[PDB]
């Protein structure tokens, strides 16, 4: 019927579509564009987040005076990152490739949804739905200024197979360079020990190795026909 299943590899290799699902195209994992310091996001679970051709500046803008500017100001683009170790300085042109996650848009027979446990346990797919993958509950992100965006929790985009504290990268449109800056934040649903209603949350600082146990888990499910 035409449902589109989108997969982001979080590696520099395009993901393979499930058998029986024609790959419509593969591309680069687009998180959001920032024009005039205003973020406009693409849902990671939707095909718009998989752009066939990469560029540090994939868009241009125009105003009512009939003037359009391409890469002629100070705009940016943000992309889902690979699990590659973070560079020490900005990377340019070809050195960018290994840092951009790849994606594939697959024509599916039924709709895919994401479910979240808000628990260390993996949430079950609803009755009559099968699992496509398991991951971590990716909720939102912020970077430059107070700009950023977030994922829809019922969208496969909110379920990333690989947890990464800094799951995306920032590209300087005009310089053709990308980098990971200290102000980048990723937000994730937490695991909640209580059955369904949590009391005043107990503040905590989690360091490498003690993080994943506090991140909600999810599964992407597809209706069995």
């Amino acid at each position: 019927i035409g449902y589109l299943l989108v997969k982001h590899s979080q590696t520099d290799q395009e993901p393979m579509c499930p058998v029986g699902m024609n790959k419509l195209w593969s591309g680069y994992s687009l998180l959001y564009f920032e024009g005039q310091e205003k973020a406009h996001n693409q849902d990671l679970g939707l095909a718009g987040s998989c752009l066939a051709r990469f560029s540090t500046m994939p868009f241009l803008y125009c105003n009512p005076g009939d003037v359009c500017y391409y890469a002629s100001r100070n705009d940016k683009s943000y992309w889902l990152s690979t699990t590659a170790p973070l560079p020490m300085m900005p990377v340019a042109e070809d050195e960018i490739k290994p840092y951009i996650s790849r994606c594939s848009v697959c024509e599916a027979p039924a709709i895919a949804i994401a479910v979240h446990s808000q628990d260390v346990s993996i949430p079950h797919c609803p009755a009559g739905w099968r699992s496509l993958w398991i991951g971590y509950s990716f909720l939102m992100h912020t970077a430059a200024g107070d700009e950023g965006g977030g994922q829809s929790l019922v969208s496969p985009g909110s379920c990333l197979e690989d947890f990464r504290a800094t799951p995306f990268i920032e590209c300087n449109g005009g310089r053709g360079t990308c980098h990971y800056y200290a102000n980048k934040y990723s937000f994730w649903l937490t695991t909640i020990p209580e059955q369904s209603f949590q009391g005043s949350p107990s503040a905590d600082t989690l360091k490498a190795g003690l993080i994943r146990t506090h991140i909600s888990r999810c599964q992407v499910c597809m209706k069995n026909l």
Binding site: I1, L86, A110, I111, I113, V115, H116, S117, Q118, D119, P126, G128, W129, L139, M140, T142, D146, E147, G148, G149, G150, S152, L153, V154, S155, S158, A165, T166, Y180, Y181, A182, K184, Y185, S186, F187, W188, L189, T190, I192, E194, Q195, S196, F197, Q198, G199, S200, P201, S202, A203, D204, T205, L206, K207, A208, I211, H214, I215, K223, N224, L225
Partner: protein
């Protein structure tokens, strides 16, 4: 045997029932949006993302470039659709178990076909499109703002933009420290009723008070395609 989801919010402490022709998947609490590092991010009320199995004033954490995450130490927010529970006479922040009676419940249900909302922008109920049947009727809810004037909104084609109960204050504000309350700057935006003669005429300003609110708000209907 396709399956589509429809999310419904009771706007009360009771679980809502799935509409006719759909089957229950799970019940939860109505999450409207969250605000992290001063950025609001909502979950469309017409999607399962607005129905969380577990409630928390701080249902998320954030991680930095040094691979260090922090939970509830800062000043972030979570917002939830609320119930008719009266705001405490003291007007002081609500905490712990006392928060429960204020949180709306929701149901995520599996439907045999797609669902959508239509808005009349009048006091009358807009009919369901040709070939679609009614799941419920409501009031056209568009967007909202709260702390720092940050907020989010609903897709007008989504059931999330059609709340069954009009509420001047449809949501409550919670903080990572564990407090929740209603604040004077919590604004709810609804589609207004417009007469045909008022469309291309300067809008007539009006300030409405208790008892005359609901009658100036656009009505809506959530419909499901017949199969």
């Amino acid at each position: 045997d396709h399956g589509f989801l429809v999310t419904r919010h009771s706007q009360t402490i009771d679980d809502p029932q799935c509409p006719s022709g759909t089957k229950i998947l799970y019940h939860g609490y109505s999450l409207l949006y969250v605000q992290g590092n001063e950025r609001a991010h909502g979950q469309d009320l017409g999607t399962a993302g607005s129905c969380l199995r577990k409630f928390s004033t701080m249902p998320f954490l954030f991680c930095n470039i040094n691979n260090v995450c922090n939970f509830a130490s800062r000043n972030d927010y979570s917002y939830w659709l609320s119930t008719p529970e009266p705001m405490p006479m003291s007007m002081a922040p609500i905490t712990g178990e006392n928060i429960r009676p204020f949180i709306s419940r929701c149901a995520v249900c599996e439907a045999p076909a797609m669902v959508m909302a239509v808005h009349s922008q009048t006091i009358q109920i807009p009919p369901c499109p040709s070939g679609w049947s009614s799941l419920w009727i409501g009031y056209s809810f568009v967007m909202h703002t709260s702390a720092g004037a940050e907020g989010s909104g609903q897709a007008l084609a989504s059931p999330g933009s059609c709340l069954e109960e009009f509420r001047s204050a449809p949501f409550i504000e919670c903080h990572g420290r564990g407090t929740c309350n209603y604040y004077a700057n919590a604004y709810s935006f609804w589609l207004a009723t417009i007469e045909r003669s008022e469309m291309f005429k300067k809008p007539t300003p009006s300030t409405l008070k208790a008892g005359e609110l609901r009658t100036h708000v656009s009505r809506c209907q959530v419909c499901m395609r017949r199969t």
